Amino acid sequence: PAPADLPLGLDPFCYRQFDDVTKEEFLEKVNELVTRDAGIEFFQGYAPFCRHLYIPNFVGALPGSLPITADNEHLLRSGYIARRPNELPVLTRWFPMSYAKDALMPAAFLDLILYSREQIAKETAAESNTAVVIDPNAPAWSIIAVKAQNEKYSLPMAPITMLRNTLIEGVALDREAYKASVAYWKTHAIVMDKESSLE
Amino acid sequence: RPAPADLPLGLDPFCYSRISGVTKEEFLEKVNELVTRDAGIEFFQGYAPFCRHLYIPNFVGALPGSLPITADNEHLLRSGYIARRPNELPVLTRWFPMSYAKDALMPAAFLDLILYSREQIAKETAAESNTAVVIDPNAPAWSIIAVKAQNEKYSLPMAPITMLRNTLIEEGGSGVALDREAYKASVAYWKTHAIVMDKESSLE
- The three state secondary structure string of chain B is CCCHHHCCCEECCCCCCCCCCCCHHHHHHHHHHHHHHCCCCCEEECCCCCEEEEEEECCCCCCCCEEECCCCCHHHCEEEEECCCCCCCCEEEEEECHHHHCCCCCCCCEEEEEEEEHHHHHHHHHHCCCCCCCCCCCCCCEEEEEEEEECCCCCCCCCHHHHHHCCCHHHCCCCCCCCHHHHHHHHHHHCCEEEECCCCCCCC
Resolution stated for this PDB structure, in Å: 2.3
Give yes or no for A4 touching B (CB within 8 A). Answer: no
Cα–Cα distance for residue pair A61/A148, rounded to 1 Å: 6
What is the identity of the amino acid at B124?
A: E
Return the number of other C-beta atoms located less than 10 Å from residue B55's C-beta. Answer: 20
Closest chain B C-alpha to A18 CA, distance in angstroms: 24
Q: Which of residues 101-160 of A touch B (CB under 8 A)?
A: 159-160
Cα–Cα distance for residue pair B82/A76, rounded to 1 Å: 17
Give yes or no for A197 touching B (CB within 8 A). Answer: yes
Cα–Cα distance for residue pair A73/B72, rounded to 1 Å: 18
Cα–Cα distance for residue pair A191/B49, rounded to 1 Å: 48
Which chain B residues have a beta carbon less than 8 Å from that of A173?
Answer: 168, 170-171
∠ Cα A62 A67 A73 (to 5°): 115
Cα–Cα distance for residue pair B29/B12, rounded to 1 Å: 14
Cα–Cα distance for residue pair A34/A139, rounded to 1 Å: 15
Give yes or no for A77 touching B (CB within 8 A). Answer: yes
Q: Do residues A106 and A61 make contact, with C-beta atoms less than 8 angstroms apart?
A: yes
Cβ–Cβ pairs < 8 A, chains A and B:
83
Q: Do residues A34 and A8 make contact, with C-beta atoms less than 8 angstroms apart?
A: yes
What is the identity of the amino acid at B131?
A: T
β-strand partners of A52: A43, A113
Q: Sort A101 into a burial class: Cβ within 10 Å, 0-12 / 13-18 / 19+.
A: exposed
CATH 3.30.2310.50 placement within chain B: 1-64+106-155
Among candidates A134, A141, A119, which has minimal Cα distance to A34? A141
Q: Do residues B8 and B30 make contact, with C-beta atoms less than 8 angstroms apart?
A: no
User: Within 13 A of B141's CA, how many CA atoms are on the CB side?
Assistant: 10
Which chain A residues have a beta carbon less than 8 Å from that of B180?
Answer: 88
Which chain A residues have a beta carbon less than 8 Å from that of B161?
Answer: 91, 160
CATH 3.30.2310.50 placement within chain A: 1-63+105-154
Q: Look at the alpha carbons of B70, B72, B73, B79 in this order and tell me if their dihedral is positive or negative.
A: positive
* CA end-to-end span of chain A: 48
CATH superfamily of B1-64+106-155: Protein of unknown function (DUF3228), domain 1 (3.30.2310.50)
Cα–Cα distance for residue pair A166/B177, rounded to 1 Å: 11
Which residues does A15 contact at the CB level (< 8 Å), separation at least 6?
Answer: A23, A143, A144, A145
∠ Cα B127 B130 B132 (to 5°): 100
∠ Cα A70 A73 A76 (to 5°): 170
Return the number of other C-beta atoms located less than 10 Å from residue B174's C-beta. Answer: 12
Q: Do residues A90 and A164 make contact, with C-beta atoms less than 8 angstroms apart?
A: yes
CB contact under 8 A, A89 and B187: yes
Cα–Cα distance for residue pair A31/A66, rounded to 1 Å: 28
Task: State in words which class domain A1-63+105-154 has.
Answer: alpha beta
Cα–Cα distance for residue pair A104/A171, rounded to 1 Å: 38
Cα–Cα distance for residue pair A154/A156, rounded to 1 Å: 6
Which method was used?
A: X-ray
